[PDB]
């Protein structure tokens with residue numbers, strides 16, 4: 001079966017029900033729509049925070065631009081890649097199209113991950129850690145996590161062993177990032193108001209959950225085993241839903257909370 005991602009595989013073999021095709025289209029559209037809304041939010045509220053914090057708002061806005069453009073591209077790629085067959089009454093991979101391509105999302109991650117990790121360092125103050133050290137660790141492990149993930153996904157269909165091994169390597173970098181971010185949160189909570197500490201607690205939980213959704217969605221088609229319930233259009237729907245929840249959470253909600261933290265920090269006098 002010529003296609004080499006899971007979406008194309010399902011599209012070429014079983015096809016997508018009307019519901020699966022339309023749901024996925026709508027959730028991807030909601031994704032980019034929220035980023036555009038977020039972009040305007042972060043621009044318009046930039047004056048609500050003190051100058052010293054504004055780099056966080058700037059980085060949120062730039063993340064919104066990248067996410068809007070690339071998630072818009074991904075959404076159009078979805079609808080362009082699958083076309084209705086009247087005889088069967090399902091949507092199949094269109095040989096006339098460009099085929100579904102995970103590249104848009106992975107590029108978004110490569111760009112956004114370093115900016116999301118960076119931006120908290122303009123709101124919290126470290127204690128015993130160095131800014132440059134934390135930044136460098138975030139950026140190195142962030143890049144390596146996405147690169148190794150991207151290598152992995154090439155083997156999603158063709159070599160489950162490679163897919164899982166590269167995934168595990170990627171997960172090692174992810175665990176490093178979690179370790180560093182937890183340290184940043186802990187140092188950030190030192191020497192701020194309890195209201196600020198509460199927001200940071202919430203940021204940590206949001207970060208932990210929203211970022212873990214990504215490897216969840218990576219594994220999704222296989223979480224019920226091969227020829228499992230999720231090894232299907234339902235796995236495709238679940239993956240894209242989970243990615244979209246993760247995107248809104250990790251980018252928009254995260255940015256909103258950091259803005260709220262910045263506002264709170266200024267209230268001590």
Ligand SMILES: *C/C=C(C)/C=C/C=C(C)/C=C/C1=C(C)CCCC1(C)C
Pocket residue numbers: 108109112113116145146148149150152167168170171174211212214215218247250251
């Ligand atoms: C706005 C986009 C963000 C915050 C993207 C984050 C992406 C990840 C945390 C990806 C993690 C992965 C693993 C930990 C293992 C499987 C491969 C990845 C790349 C999905």
Ligand code: NA
Pocket residue numbers: 078079080081082083084
């Ligand atoms: Na179509």
